[PDB]
Amino acid sequence: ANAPGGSNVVNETPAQTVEVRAAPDALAFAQTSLSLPANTVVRLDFVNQNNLGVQHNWVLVNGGDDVAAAVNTAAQNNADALFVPPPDTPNALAWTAMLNAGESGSVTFRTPAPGTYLYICTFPGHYLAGMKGTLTVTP
Template sequence: MKTHLRLFLLSAVLGVSLLLTACGGSSTSTPAASSGGTGPVTLELGSAGENLAFDKTELSVSSGQQVTVKFTDNSAAQQHNWVLARGGDDVAQKIATEGLVAGADKNYLPTDPANIIANTTLANAGQTVEVTFTAPAPGTYTFFCTVPGHYPLMKGVLTVN
């Protein structure tokens, strides 16, 4: 009789501690409250006609802001894309080189996306493509096109405040 009671108490204690563990686990994943009053923003840019350039070379957003980039290929024949690097020109150069190897089937993007914050797919002439992402930590980031030969001509800087 006494043994049964102890077993019951033991299993009850174990059950409670399991429940506590489960609750503790879920509470840590509660998203942090958004700071500041920056709502979602849409940035529109395009290629500069037939030039290997964007029609805007400076963009700015706020850290944590939801950003949608709408990119229009204004060329009559060329493909372009819009890629945001997790860093500056050194990182962009590496992505462009790896993208060239990957080929058009992969949107001229490296297999490992670790250094890419956001990217559109390839846009054909006259096409608009878009991508939505959360603005990273404050700093400056290079955006560019990875179609072979377009970087480092076709690039700009996103400033995150």
């Protein structure tokens, strides 16, 4: 059940691909901002290489910190799937599987309308520790 997912996942050829990496020595993404065009199919490749031996995922939410906390809270209660958002979690646009240190995983999705959206990691504690970034979706 540890698998990618999200309301905007599509089985379509990506128009763009983007790489995200974990910070090697912190509970953070290496990229704290992303930018993509609206209504476009993108493959996001999350490469989790870190020196902590720690797990991480990439989760795009349909909003800011209030929505992020909601999605994060639903994932916190999904220990059997290693803390990814449960399927059909409200306002969770896309996520990768939860990746062990050394693992890489993608998610292919249609970006939402123009606007600003948080991406977070839902492994317990990481979102509260600051593991988040801002996706700005342009026209």
